Amino acid sequence: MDNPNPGPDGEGEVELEKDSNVVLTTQRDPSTSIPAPVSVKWSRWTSNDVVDDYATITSRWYQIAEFVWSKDDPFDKELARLILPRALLSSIEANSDAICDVPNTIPFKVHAYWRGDMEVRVQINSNKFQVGQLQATWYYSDHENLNISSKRSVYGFSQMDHALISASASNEAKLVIPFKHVYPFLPTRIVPDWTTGILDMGALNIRVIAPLRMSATGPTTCNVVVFIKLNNSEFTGTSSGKFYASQIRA
Amino acid sequence: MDNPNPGPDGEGEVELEKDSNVVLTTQRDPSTSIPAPVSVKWSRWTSNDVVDDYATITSRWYQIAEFVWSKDDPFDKELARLILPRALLSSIEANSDAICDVPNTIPFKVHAYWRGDMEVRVQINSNKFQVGQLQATWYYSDHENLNISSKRSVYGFSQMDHALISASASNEAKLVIPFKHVYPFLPTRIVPDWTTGILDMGALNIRVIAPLRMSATGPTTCNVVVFIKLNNSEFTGTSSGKFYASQIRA
Amino acid sequence: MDNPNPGPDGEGEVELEKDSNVVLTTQRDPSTSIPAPVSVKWSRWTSNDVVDDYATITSRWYQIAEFVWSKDDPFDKELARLILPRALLSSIEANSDAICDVPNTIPFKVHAYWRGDMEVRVQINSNKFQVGQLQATWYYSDHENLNISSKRSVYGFSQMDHALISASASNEAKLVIPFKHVYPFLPTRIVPDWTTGILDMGALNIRVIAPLRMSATGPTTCNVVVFIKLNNSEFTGTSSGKFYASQIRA
């Protein structure tokens, strides 16, 4: 079946992802990447306090990153290497804004410990005349590894669970990332231990496998949007906001 | 389903509209605009004489207009403001041709009064690299309104029944226009009343909502075809042709 | 149905033709051309000796020709006029290679007489911005006709069984050519008769019906691939290879 019928509305389907007071669309189905099974709820294990999450409020879609994709970028050059708990907060905090100001962060302010699966969209608007390729990959503990520069390479992450994005026919990388840390919970700020590496479950990272191969005088620049949903969460550990921690640098 | 298979014949469907000794096609389904219900037959009311229409002859598709669409045309600039009974005749008469010469007009020559629904095609051949938009709109009595210049605007006709045409993915505006005048019949020429505004049931009018937005050195010009079918008619009122009226100017 | 969904893999089906240790694909269904019924097996008629063919070995897909398609080529200019038994061997022999070296020829070396249907692919990689047209046509005995230059024309072969190839939406010409000679068998080399015209069942020939109509500075050159399958064969007539014949010139 192939009859093209673009009316006053150029025809084509648009799948949407609402899902909680925010609707974000994608005109092209994503290339998913599921690195692990869905995480069970270990609140009834580690902590016996206010055991809950926040539905309509922390299970939304906030923006955490956005960047540029150009012909200048050589073969393996990561556009982002963003930590995943974590840079949800660390993006907003360095936006000359506070964590307290946004609805998808506020319990991190009050509550001490967090556990939950993650959802991520790597949406880009590239043109059909751009011949490039990216790869969004996940690593459940990047900073803990010593020589991960060895792994920090397009070759290395192809070896593992990832998603693929090609400039033409742009395209989205779905990226379901459930919770798998060593300890079942994460600490939102400084704690009797975890005096650093606060709220870090691993980093995402997008490098390049094919530069934007542009014709003579073709459009140079491109762009990426990183979105994140925090579903299936649990926030036990009620603590005043003066105990909080404005996350570390990029 | 999306497998593209363009053989020696580039594949794609072509819907056709024959319908009476003329076949006109459209490779893209139209955006219809039905302003009113189908009109009932009031011949057995106003006049008791030869009560009939003409099938294969006046229910065809003649051309009445054609024009240019260019980047120069600013935002709201009507390409045509053509009266609808009316300019079926008024186009041919000013073509240095006579009404008598064409089969889709001849009963208007002889017969005194006419009633009937109308069918109209606003077909254009624009290219997929042209980013513009038109709007064909109908008004069951334009000349009767005094300040209709107020209405003569892209904003105003969007308020009402219309069709939309965008340059890219060109595209057709189906435009079924049934009979709705004040008096159930129309006079083909001067009459004991209707000494002017002869044969006028309202005017069609195509303005611009988006100019042809062309890249550097992209194709400048475009073009429109206006076709018209006169179905569901009735022509009671037999009169010699020396009583006829060559319609007024553009 | 027309929803376009080109993921990291630009979506679209790819039909394949394996068929015997070689897989060749075509992303666009072919325009077939069947000039005759399937040939019956006349081995149990002409010759009472080792009656067999060779499956996995001579029923493969070898390349016999490839050439250039450019704007310079005027209206009717044959890109190839290749004989069909025949140039399967005659291409390889003039490749500074021997017949003995390739698996799809070796029985022709040993065996004296051959009969069999033929399969041919005229695959080309033209771009969607090239507006040309070719025509691959078959003639069960071209050399036998005296004034076939009269027939050697785009007009003439359109009169008969052929396939059509247009530059844009490139495209393949399937070309099933069963055996129909005067005598039911063909001689692989010189023989008590057939002292010339060795192994010739007719010639294929691709001319032009529409040159590559290229925009300013659009891509000039193009290209064709000719493939051939020799199925439904029969090779009776065992003879030493010193009796063989390296085919005549192009």
mmCIF file of N, CA, C and O in Angstrom, chain C residues 101-152:
data_model
loop_
_atom_site.group_PDB
_atom_site.id
_atom_site.type_symbol
_atom_site.label_atom_id
_atom_site.label_comp_id
_atom_site.label_asym_id
_atom_site.label_seq_id
_atom_site.Cartn_x
_atom_site.Cartn_y
_atom_site.Cartn_z
ATOM 1 N N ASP C 101 36.906 -20.943 -15.938
ATOM 2 C CA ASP C 101 37.166 -20.399 -14.615
ATOM 3 C C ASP C 101 35.895 -20.181 -13.799
ATOM 4 O O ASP C 101 35.921 -20.233 -12.573
ATOM 5 N N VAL C 102 34.788 -19.940 -14.490
ATOM 6 C CA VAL C 102 33.516 -19.626 -13.845
ATOM 7 C C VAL C 102 32.529 -20.799 -13.864
ATOM 8 O O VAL C 102 32.413 -21.505 -14.869
ATOM 9 N N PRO C 103 31.804 -21.000 -12.747
ATOM 10 C CA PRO C 103 30.866 -22.108 -12.533
ATOM 11 C C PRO C 103 29.610 -22.075 -13.401
ATOM 12 O O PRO C 103 28.975 -23.115 -13.572
ATOM 13 N N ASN C 104 29.260 -20.912 -13.937
ATOM 14 C CA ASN C 104 28.046 -20.786 -14.734
ATOM 15 C C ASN C 104 28.307 -20.975 -16.222
ATOM 16 O O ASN C 104 27.465 -20.655 -17.058
ATOM 17 N N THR C 105 29.478 -21.504 -16.553
ATOM 18 C CA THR C 105 29.842 -21.698 -17.945
ATOM 19 C C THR C 105 30.432 -23.077 -18.183
ATOM 20 O O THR C 105 30.341 -23.612 -19.284
ATOM 21 N N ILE C 106 31.031 -23.653 -17.143
ATOM 22 C CA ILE C 106 31.813 -24.882 -17.292
ATOM 23 C C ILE C 106 31.154 -26.029 -18.082
ATOM 24 O O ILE C 106 31.865 -26.779 -18.751
ATOM 25 N N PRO C 107 29.814 -26.186 -18.019
ATOM 26 C CA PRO C 107 29.351 -27.304 -18.846
ATOM 27 C C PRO C 107 29.352 -26.963 -20.323
ATOM 28 O O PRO C 107 29.459 -27.873 -21.140
ATOM 29 N N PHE C 108 29.261 -25.679 -20.656
ATOM 30 C CA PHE C 108 29.356 -25.259 -22.049
ATOM 31 C C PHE C 108 30.717 -25.663 -22.608
ATOM 32 O O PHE C 108 30.847 -25.972 -23.792
ATOM 33 N N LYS C 109 31.727 -25.652 -21.744
ATOM 34 C CA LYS C 109 33.080 -26.054 -22.114
ATOM 35 C C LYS C 109 33.116 -27.519 -22.536
ATOM 36 O O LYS C 109 33.605 -27.859 -23.611
ATOM 37 N N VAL C 110 32.607 -28.383 -21.668
ATOM 38 C CA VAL C 110 32.593 -29.809 -21.939
ATOM 39 C C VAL C 110 31.476 -30.228 -22.886
ATOM 40 O O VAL C 110 31.714 -30.880 -23.893
ATOM 41 N N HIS C 111 30.251 -29.846 -22.568
ATOM 42 C CA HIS C 111 29.103 -30.370 -23.293
ATOM 43 C C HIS C 111 28.898 -29.674 -24.639
ATOM 44 O O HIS C 111 29.138 -28.477 -24.769
ATOM 45 N N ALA C 112 28.466 -30.438 -25.642
ATOM 46 C CA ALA C 112 28.377 -29.949 -27.021
ATOM 47 C C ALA C 112 27.119 -29.126 -27.325
ATOM 48 O O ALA C 112 27.203 -28.092 -27.984
ATOM 49 N N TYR C 113 25.959 -29.583 -26.861
ATOM 50 C CA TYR C 113 24.699 -28.921 -27.196
ATOM 51 C C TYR C 113 23.938 -28.467 -25.956
ATOM 52 O O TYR C 113 23.994 -29.112 -24.910
ATOM 53 N N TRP C 114 23.217 -27.358 -26.083
ATOM 54 C CA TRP C 114 22.478 -26.803 -24.955
ATOM 55 C C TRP C 114 21.091 -26.306 -25.322
ATOM 56 O O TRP C 114 20.887 -25.714 -26.381
ATOM 57 N N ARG C 115 20.142 -26.563 -24.430
ATOM 58 C CA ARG C 115 18.797 -26.022 -24.527
ATOM 59 C C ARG C 115 18.331 -25.557 -23.157
ATOM 60 O O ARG C 115 18.576 -26.227 -22.152
ATOM 61 N N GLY C 116 17.674 -24.405 -23.103
ATOM 62 C CA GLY C 116 17.177 -23.915 -21.834
ATOM 63 C C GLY C 116 16.583 -22.524 -21.879
ATOM 64 O O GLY C 116 16.982 -21.695 -22.695
ATOM 65 N N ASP C 117 15.610 -22.280 -21.006
ATOM 66 C CA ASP C 117 15.042 -20.953 -20.823
ATOM 67 C C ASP C 117 16.073 -20.036 -20.170
ATOM 68 O O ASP C 117 17.065 -20.502 -19.601
ATOM 69 N N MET C 118 15.832 -18.731 -20.252
ATOM 70 C CA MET C 118 16.778 -17.758 -19.735
ATOM 71 C C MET C 118 16.078 -16.811 -18.770
ATOM 72 O O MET C 118 14.882 -16.556 -18.901
ATOM 73 N N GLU C 119 16.813 -16.299 -17.793
ATOM 74 C CA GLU C 119 16.284 -15.242 -16.943
ATOM 75 C C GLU C 119 17.260 -14.069 -16.911
ATOM 76 O O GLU C 119 18.468 -14.273 -16.823
ATOM 77 N N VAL C 120 16.739 -12.846 -16.972
ATOM 78 C CA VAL C 120 17.582 -11.656 -17.080
ATOM 79 C C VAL C 120 17.088 -10.501 -16.213
ATOM 80 O O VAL C 120 15.890 -10.234 -16.144
ATOM 81 N N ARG C 121 18.021 -9.834 -15.540
ATOM 82 C CA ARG C 121 17.711 -8.636 -14.772
ATOM 83 C C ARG C 121 18.412 -7.426 -15.379
ATOM 84 O O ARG C 121 19.616 -7.460 -15.616
ATOM 85 N N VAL C 122 17.662 -6.363 -15.639
ATOM 86 C CA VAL C 122 18.278 -5.118 -16.076
ATOM 87 C C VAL C 122 18.094 -4.107 -14.950
ATOM 88 O O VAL C 122 17.218 -3.243 -14.999
ATOM 89 N N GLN C 123 18.924 -4.249 -13.920
ATOM 90 C CA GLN C 123 18.888 -3.379 -12.754
ATOM 91 C C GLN C 123 19.693 -2.113 -12.991
ATOM 92 O O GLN C 123 20.788 -2.167 -13.549
ATOM 93 N N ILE C 124 19.148 -0.969 -12.591
ATOM 94 C CA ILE C 124 19.908 0.278 -12.624
ATOM 95 C C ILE C 124 19.697 1.102 -11.352
ATOM 96 O O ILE C 124 18.653 1.017 -10.700
ATOM 97 N N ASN C 125 20.712 1.878 -10.990
ATOM 98 C CA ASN C 125 20.612 2.816 -9.878
ATOM 99 C C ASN C 125 20.547 4.244 -10.377
ATOM 100 O O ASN C 125 21.559 4.930 -10.427
ATOM 101 N N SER C 126 19.360 4.690 -10.765
ATOM 102 C CA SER C 126 19.183 6.080 -11.151
ATOM 103 C C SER C 126 18.547 6.856 -10.008
ATOM 104 O O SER C 126 17.950 6.276 -9.104
ATOM 105 N N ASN C 127 18.684 8.172 -10.052
ATOM 106 C CA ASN C 127 18.228 9.017 -8.961
ATOM 107 C C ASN C 127 16.842 9.571 -9.245
ATOM 108 O O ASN C 127 16.424 9.622 -10.398
ATOM 109 N N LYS C 128 16.124 9.976 -8.199
ATOM 110 C CA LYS C 128 14.747 10.442 -8.365
ATOM 111 C C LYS C 128 14.651 11.785 -9.084
ATOM 112 O O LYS C 128 13.551 12.268 -9.361
ATOM 113 N N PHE C 129 15.796 12.385 -9.386
ATOM 114 C CA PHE C 129 15.814 13.675 -10.061
ATOM 115 C C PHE C 129 16.279 13.544 -11.499
ATOM 116 O O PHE C 129 16.634 14.535 -12.141
ATOM 117 N N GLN C 130 16.273 12.314 -11.999
ATOM 118 C CA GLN C 130 16.642 12.058 -13.382
ATOM 119 C C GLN C 130 15.403 11.629 -14.161
ATOM 120 O O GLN C 130 14.690 10.713 -13.758
ATOM 121 N N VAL C 131 15.138 12.308 -15.270
ATOM 122 C CA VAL C 131 13.894 12.098 -15.995
ATOM 123 C C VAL C 131 14.125 11.448 -17.358
ATOM 124 O O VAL C 131 13.946 12.080 -18.398
ATOM 125 N N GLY C 132 14.500 10.175 -17.351
ATOM 126 C CA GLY C 132 14.781 9.471 -18.586
ATOM 127 C C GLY C 132 14.007 8.177 -18.723
ATOM 128 O O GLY C 132 13.240 7.823 -17.828
ATOM 129 N N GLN C 133 14.199 7.477 -19.841
ATOM 130 C CA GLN C 133 13.563 6.178 -20.048
ATOM 131 C C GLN C 133 14.307 5.279 -21.033
ATOM 132 O O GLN C 133 14.719 5.713 -22.106
ATOM 133 N N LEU C 134 14.467 4.018 -20.642
ATOM 134 C CA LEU C 134 15.083 2.983 -21.471
ATOM 135 C C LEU C 134 14.068 1.916 -21.881
ATOM 136 O O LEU C 134 12.946 1.894 -21.372
ATOM 137 N N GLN C 135 14.440 1.048 -22.818
ATOM 138 C CA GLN C 135 13.605 -0.124 -23.089
ATOM 139 C C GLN C 135 14.408 -1.366 -23.491
ATOM 140 O O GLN C 135 15.084 -1.390 -24.522
ATOM 141 N N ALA C 136 14.347 -2.387 -22.637
ATOM 142 C CA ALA C 136 14.990 -3.667 -22.903
ATOM 143 C C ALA C 136 14.050 -4.555 -23.704
ATOM 144 O O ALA C 136 12.947 -4.868 -23.258
ATOM 145 N N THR C 137 14.484 -4.966 -24.887
ATOM 146 C CA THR C 137 13.626 -5.756 -25.755
ATOM 147 C C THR C 137 14.320 -7.006 -26.269
ATOM 148 O O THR C 137 15.540 -7.036 -26.406
ATOM 149 N N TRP C 138 13.529 -8.034 -26.554
ATOM 150 C CA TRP C 138 14.048 -9.328 -26.972
ATOM 151 C C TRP C 138 13.597 -9.725 -28.382
ATOM 152 O O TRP C 138 12.497 -9.377 -28.810
ATOM 153 N N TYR C 139 14.450 -10.454 -29.099
ATOM 154 C CA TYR C 139 14.157 -10.876 -30.469
ATOM 155 C C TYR C 139 14.746 -12.262 -30.744
ATOM 156 O O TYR C 139 15.959 -12.426 -30.836
ATOM 157 N N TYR C 140 13.877 -13.259 -30.874
ATOM 158 C CA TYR C 140 14.298 -14.660 -30.849
ATOM 159 C C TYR C 140 15.236 -15.076 -31.970
ATOM 160 O O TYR C 140 15.714 -16.211 -31.990
ATOM 161 N N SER C 141 15.500 -14.163 -32.892
ATOM 162 C CA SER C 141 16.477 -14.401 -33.941
ATOM 163 C C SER C 141 16.742 -13.107 -34.676
ATOM 164 O O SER C 141 16.064 -12.779 -35.647
ATOM 165 N N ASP C 142 17.736 -12.370 -34.204
ATOM 166 C CA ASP C 142 18.018 -11.060 -34.754
ATOM 167 C C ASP C 142 18.964 -11.125 -35.947
ATOM 168 O O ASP C 142 18.749 -10.451 -36.955
ATOM 169 N N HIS C 143 19.995 -11.954 -35.842
ATOM 170 C CA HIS C 143 21.028 -12.002 -36.868
ATOM 171 C C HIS C 143 20.511 -12.664 -38.138
ATOM 172 O O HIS C 143 21.030 -12.430 -39.228
ATOM 173 N N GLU C 144 19.489 -13.494 -37.993
ATOM 174 C CA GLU C 144 18.938 -14.217 -39.127
ATOM 175 C C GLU C 144 18.175 -13.280 -40.069
ATOM 176 O O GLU C 144 18.142 -13.501 -41.280
ATOM 177 N N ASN C 145 17.556 -12.242 -39.511
ATOM 178 C CA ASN C 145 16.903 -11.199 -40.312
ATOM 179 C C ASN C 145 17.923 -10.336 -41.069
ATOM 180 O O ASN C 145 18.923 -9.921 -40.489
ATOM 181 N N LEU C 146 17.661 -10.032 -42.342
ATOM 182 C CA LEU C 146 18.587 -9.204 -43.127
ATOM 183 C C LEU C 146 18.544 -7.715 -42.852
ATOM 184 O O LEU C 146 19.566 -7.108 -42.536
ATOM 185 N N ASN C 147 17.361 -7.122 -42.958
ATOM 186 C CA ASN C 147 17.236 -5.703 -42.675
ATOM 187 C C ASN C 147 16.507 -5.612 -41.361
ATOM 188 O O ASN C 147 15.284 -5.527 -41.294
ATOM 189 N N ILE C 148 17.307 -5.650 -40.310
ATOM 190 C CA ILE C 148 16.812 -5.627 -38.958
ATOM 191 C C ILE C 148 17.301 -4.332 -38.350
ATOM 192 O O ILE C 148 16.948 -3.976 -37.226
ATOM 193 N N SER C 149 18.152 -3.644 -39.103
ATOM 194 C CA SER C 149 18.450 -2.247 -38.831
ATOM 195 C C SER C 149 17.153 -1.450 -38.881
ATOM 196 O O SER C 149 16.958 -0.500 -38.123
ATOM 197 N N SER C 150 16.278 -1.851 -39.800
ATOM 198 C CA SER C 150 14.924 -1.320 -39.891
ATOM 199 C C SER C 150 14.183 -1.521 -38.579
ATOM 200 O O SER C 150 13.416 -0.664 -38.141
ATOM 201 N N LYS C 151 14.428 -2.668 -37.958
ATOM 202 C CA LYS C 151 13.788 -3.016 -36.704
ATOM 203 C C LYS C 151 14.588 -2.441 -35.545
ATOM 204 O O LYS C 151 14.030 -2.085 -34.507
ATOM 205 N N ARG C 152 15.898 -2.314 -35.747
ATOM 206 C CA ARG C 152 16.787 -1.768 -34.727
ATOM 207 C C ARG C 152 16.436 -0.303 -34.476
ATOM 208 O O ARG C 152 17.121 0.610 -34.945
#
